């Protein structure tokens, strides 16, 4: 216990004086989250996040900010300690640092939509106290892109990316409402009510007006907010609580609620009932159940790495091992904090609900410039891009974090009916296609679709034909089902989605003369595009996905998949073109011995490799799509045939970025390349100081730690996410990091479990990870030797293959 705690020994740090909100700690219960900090004056401040606080603009909003100010500063000169305790699910502040009980104890109940702030003066001497609601959305705020200055409004272009093509080039951020507080009461309350919605105009632009009566508006009249109260407080204003009598021990309770409401009073009635109900619960019983929830969560799985004690080693290896261990845990803490949405909202890759900021003063605000510092901002806006989001969820399987995965699958399942009707209308065949990115309700945004597009093919070439996510989602769900053996999940979530995706892939294209499907028009992820409709033929990601997924669907238990489904899937499988293969040639910048960047530059003497497609043009991004057959689809890798094909492909890759969504490290682990994998894990989760980087001086991809935040695991986006400083935490970075470390330890080969496929011997490790058939593997490697291995259930031990650390 304490193994993952984060301890700070001072209120002061690099940005405390001018930007204390950059020194927050995150904490959540899966739906409600806080970013909490202590300012140099001793105030406790926190921003409030919620997974489903979607505004009229589709913007994910903070619920607000709260400031607690004791009448007498509670800090002392002697010492100070602020600690994140993940196994108790809490943040605690001690002053002095050795005080027996914390000055501030902050937690979000694992089991209820309430957060608690408990205060205890160290002297036991009573104090007055005031809590202020700090809302910044008090009047409508204009964000405008002006004709001569398109690049100036980063808030417009990046924070409202999905709306960038709105006619008129104006986004208005509607304000919030503070409810009148009851005179003499101990409660204040506030919320945001969506009085309008972008959804009807979007359906009309996308030729889907006919679906408007069938699927209700997902934004209109959505109302979300919170109630703040505390025993012994009185509302001295609608935005202010104060202690009536000085106290040495007191508490604030924050209850959060989202619903659909005709007005804020209706919302407030339901939220007051929620507060009444939950305030009646015994807080110590709630605290015990909260702590037990977190103890069990951390007992599901772990990876604890350290340097071994063999003479001749390098102490930096131990330093890196420990840093990697802490980072892996902090990623898990943030995903759990945001990963049990009450409304099937996937974890936002661009900051989850743990973004921070501080609004610029109204008097300084310029609508033509916007405000990227404001608390609601996130680079990339609110749409959910699969290429980033998949990396958050893949590692949850080996962690055993099935509950964190269900909202992602549920999101797609709830969108399936609309997207099936859309496909029926657009394409006049069965099935459903899921765009690479779009709004949470499943449709692409109008910028990617095209304002006034007379057709139904997406205008944006980056994602015009990219629908591979549906296949990859199906593969992830198949792993979930194999692990949990949850038949209800199989029948009610996996199968309808798999049915739609597989039917689309069977019906949207035509068989050619050889009887095999010709995948054109098509593209290979976002890197090889098809402006002509003919530039890309037979992309490897999609073909590899069908090769990996269709046999598994065909083999599902009797009475789940239908015999008719099996017949259709078998025919699709039998009609697949081959996985794209070829030889090395000249790649990007005419470099030799590479994956040929124009498909036509293969050299007859080149090494045999996988290709990103059978036919493809020049690159428009920096993905290595040919590697999809290694990860996620496990067609090649250590312990599988044609390992040299996989290795040649990896060595010949054109793109070698690290951190963010870059997934080279995962592929290296899948190929048994322990050194490559270790290096990438160290870049994502630590700092790579090793001299020969294959990268320029001061390459940003040598470390993913935050540039400016005190909680350094608020990852920064990787260089391949583009030029700017993005939004932190970039959870795709930490998701990739988890996949790398897990894949170094454990990989599945159908029913078999391969341990230590790419593990460096200099690292001792104690781990517990999950696998298919409700199996856990708990192992301890010391000085390169497996000292202990416990497999549950025991009969599954016979399916474990133990490889040697390298």
Numbering used by the authors: 26 to 831
Direct quotes from the study:
In this report, we present the 3D structure of BT0984GH139, alongside its homolog SDT91673.1GH139 from Verrucomicrobium sp. Crystals of BT0984GH139 formed in space group P212121 and diffracted to a resolution of 2.7 Å, while crystals of SDT91673.1GH139 formed in space group P 6522 and diffracted to 2.05 Å, providing good quality electron density maps in both cases. Both proteins adopt a three-domain architecture, consisting of an N-terminal β-sheet domain leading into an α-helical domain composed of a core (α/α)6 toroid structure. GH139 enzymes operate via an inverting mechanism in which we propose that N412 functions as the catalytic base and E561 acts as the catalytic acid (BT0984GH139 numbering).
To test whether an ortholog of BT0984GH139 from a soil environment was also an exo-acting 2-O-methyl-α-L-fucosidase, we cloned and recombinantly expressed, in Escherichia coli, SDT91673.1GH139 from Verrucomicrobium sp. GAS474; an organism isolated from a forest in Harvard, USA. However, SDT91673.1GH139 showed no detectable activity on any of the substrates tested. The openness of the SDT91673.1GH139 pocket is facilitated by residues T462, T551, A487, and D473, which replace Q461, E561, W403, and E472 in BT0984GH139. Specifically, W162 and W490 are spatially replaced by R189 and R186, respectively, introducing a more positively charged character. In SDT91673.1GH139, one of the rare (<1%) GH139 sequences that lacks the proposed catalytic acid, E561 (BT0984GH139 numbering), this position is instead occupied by T551. Interestingly, SDT91673.1GH139 belongs to the ∼1% of GH139 sequences that lack a catalytic acid residue, suggesting it may not serve an enzymatic role in Verrucomicrobium sp. GAS474 from which it was isolated, but instead may act as a glycan-binding protein for a substrate distinct from chain B of RG-II.
